[PDB]
Symmetry: D3
Subunit: 223 residues, 6 copies
């Protein structure tokens, strides 16, 4: 297992990356979160510009990494982290636009399951429709933590799309189906976690209504 | 709306079926839960065999109903209960064959999510892949009860198939994907609940490898 | 295969079920047909309320049985009947909504074929699109009987839907394609029969009109046609 | 106002209410020479010769349709929608999937499995089953029975390719025989509310035209 | 090779068909081109009414034949030509309707790519979406020719439809597809699969909003 | 070309700062190397998400170079913006690829006349059939001319835009004559067509997906992409 490190996308040696990785798309947010919350910060990756740091938050060892944009981008990083680097738990953190009209800006969405456009599923030769879900233990602790620090949260279904810019109007059906917010990464993360028998959770803060450090604290309490 | 009750599939009048319904496939099993766990029992449905009872369990009014076999069947019932009879919570109970090799017989599986073959998803004109999930609050309440009442349980993904009898084998990929157990109803329920903004949980007892204990876990969620 | 009888869905022993089984979704409709048309009736199944009876009609032994609603439900029963109980012929008799505007309430519809929403064709691993068809001989015998008894009937395509309540309007394209009536079970039955090399036919009475104002005891004429096909 | 078309040379009325089609322009010319009186060519375009004559009194036309579902699609549509054809009977050779079919047996396509044709053009929200018209079907079985010919009636499969292991599941399902044209015809006739049947003589096994020509012509009205 | 000639669709003996075939649907266009441009004209095929001709263009061997209508039809001929007759190039020449508003009647369209309705892609067992492209060399040579002779042309994507009679043109137009016909894609697929060369060129005859082509095509004689 | 929408959430550049030709690679490091190596009067216009972008001059002609991340949704975002907000005319992608075709050697350039693909965003275009993703023909022809004239080993044909890096589904692609696998082309091609602009994806073979599976020496993956850059650069106008 350690034999396949480093990877073509990650310059770190085995053991260099903690058992709990927090991930965001932005390397600037990853670089910030590390500087803001972690002592003894050590950079393990810079390959592909995708920074990764290991450090300490309230005693527990913890790593952060950027994942770039889209299911195939996160797909690569997650696969390596789980299958090559002995990662047990990934929590993704990022921004989202809301489909649920009752959501206010700055609300925390917890991705219990993820709808998606086609990405990885065809690689698994699955003879039906596969539902992407987060790890329940992780999901539960985020809800507990969210309700402890008194933050407005919503827990349920999200949609990992392939587009940022819709050509037509497609948000209709998802909205009717009760999908909460749109992003572009979660479903691949869930699929990869499932296949690895590992823990994964996606958490989102609402940045655009389609009708920020507060989220980080919830995430951090999960390490 | 009360206007649409009775339905062609349910002879109960509006108000007669409580806000929490506990469902199972077998009408005989439903009658056992009623005769066993419920006081002041009144039969509200006998249409097409699918019996339905309303009564009391530790103070709260609570109803139990049969749903037949397969997604279109639970589909019809779940739709009417959510959309006509003002039901807010359906917790489904049943037996299942295990895909996860770590499961023992009599284990309780909690359906956080449901894989499925096509049913009436195409009826919702969804421009992508929809994922059927249970209501989180119910899910947590069951996980709480399982860890409270000291029972072996796993929580996660299940598969609602359209067949009981396979031609060849298709269980391989599901097992590779970490699907916990196979049944035939959950996905439609979750899907229909989501569309109504209503609560739904599917809870399974392992009968096959590829009962009273579970009923209590359910009853604690009403 | 006597070894697999009884099943988890059927408490009948091998040989307790006749070689021709008529099926309806409603267990109450089943119990009526048995009381109205059959003599020497024995109940063979009560499992899951899916009542089944064996009896005689004009000398010929036959069974009648409930299947519940939906393709996976009939799928379970038909599979066992064809493969475990040695059944040769299944005739489904049900209600249906009219797509064809010349059909009136009470008209019989004979389903030479069935369009469908996905049931378990993907489980058969079919590399293309499968057309579900009834047995020709049964089909022919039904039309003849309807002709001889002078009941208004249509013979053609029907649609096996997975939904009862449409979340919109999907009926249009079907109606354009000459589909006669909608129901919920046939395609799965046809498919399973084909695979077993046995005989299936689904016959319907129009109980609802899915056009015009929607106008919503007459199931008797259909039971007679079905009953005549028993061998 | 629609006749002639860019694929069919005839003006309206030149084609009878019953048409019989085969793939090969020779079998079409033969059929006329063999069974028809007062034969007249209506079509010459694309080399798809059409003939109008009389069989035992009744007006009848015979015509080539080329190869594949899109090809038959073009003629069948034109025939049904512009020319007022009521009945179309395809007569073809085919290869047997069913082990018990022997060479020269008649198969009558009550139903047709398919590779994707122009179903996608009809906006059908589900799987559509292509069925033959029941009446022609009943008449052909009766005719085969009365004349004492070996025949089977059931499902056939309209493939998009001639040269291929895509057959196992088809065989498993009891499909009798493979050809390339039936399904599109069934769809178009259904869509037009008209009558269609595809009958085949078994020429190959995948494991005597005259007799079939006779069954066919008895379907003319 | 030799033991498959003639075939049950093509009556020609091996060698009787040149290394470059030009194909069209209308058997009239096939005979006319031979009569117009070729020396030493000899007919080979007559089966199915699919006339075939081998002669000389400017001192190289060249054949011309009909392919009927539809991807299944061209599929049969292109397959046989490529795999049994040792053909190396097939250039289809045809009429087509314009999607692109800027295309004028008589303009040449060169099919660098073909969009399609399902043909027999399903036959190859392809686990993704396959793009049908032309051979680059023939494609580039046809442009050079269109330039040197100064005829109006565009090069881009075309769409090989299964139907002649329909309104599904909108999204195709949005995607910048140049024109519709019925044969190109299957031709591209079979050529690709056989590691040989294929190009479809079309004269615009309809607007959905032949000699000048022949010369460009013949210039691809080798 | 819509000045109102610039900068974007993914691109900090104002309108006019990005040239009419943009060359694109996945790695921000390779992009910076290309700029330092071939361009003069270089200005950085973007640093958002580490998606570095530079504008400079090559033999007199203004052009831009930019990181596009990994995957079709990633290139999709950038190409969409460049084509539709920045007034870009030409996008040439230049990447590494694995060889499916057995006659290809490590170092060979592959010109993607067409791109097969796993579903990206074709479903958002509501296309009622199967869509073939093609390069712009002029750009394609210009790349072949340049390679032939410069005498570099090249092959032009079909490529495959996979959605996965870690898979044996490759066989059917191989039988269909697909040359090489990468991860971005189909989306770029798709977006160009819809915009009516020009795209081309060029690749260097860094991995052989057959035989012993010889992969490029650590030096060459950072140093043998030179010849392809020279071809790509010559296409700038």
């Amino acid at each position: 297992m350690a034999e396949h490190c480093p990877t073509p996308h990650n310059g770190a040696k085995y053991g260099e990356i903690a058992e709990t990785v927090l991930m965001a798309g932005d390397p600037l947010r990853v670089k910030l979160l590390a500087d803001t919350y972690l002592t003894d910060v050590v950079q393990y990756n810079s390959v592909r510009g995708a920074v990764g740091y290991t450090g300490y938050y309230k005693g527990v060892k913890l790593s952060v990494q950027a994942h770039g944009m889209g299911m195939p981008s996160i797909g690569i990083y997650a696969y390596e982290l789980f299958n090559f680097y002995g990662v047990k738990r990934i929590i993704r953190i990022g921004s989202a636009g809301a489909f649920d009209e009752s959501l206010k800006l700055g609300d925390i969405v917890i991705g219990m399951g993820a709808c998606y456009d086609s990405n990885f599923e065809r690689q698994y030769d699955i003879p039906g429709k596969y539902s992407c879900i987060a790890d329940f233990q992780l999901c539960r602790e985020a809800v507990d933590a969210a309700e402890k620090l008194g933050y407005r949260y919503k827990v349920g279904n999200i949609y990992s799309a392939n587009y940022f810019y819709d050509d037509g109007d497609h948000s209709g059906a998802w909205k009717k189906m009760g999908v909460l917010a749109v992003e572009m990464e979660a479903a691949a993360l869930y699929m990869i976690a499932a296949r690895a028998r590992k823990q994964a959770l996606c958490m989102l803060t609402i940045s655009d209504l389609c009708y920020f450090t507060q989220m980080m604290e919830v995430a951090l309490s999960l390490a």
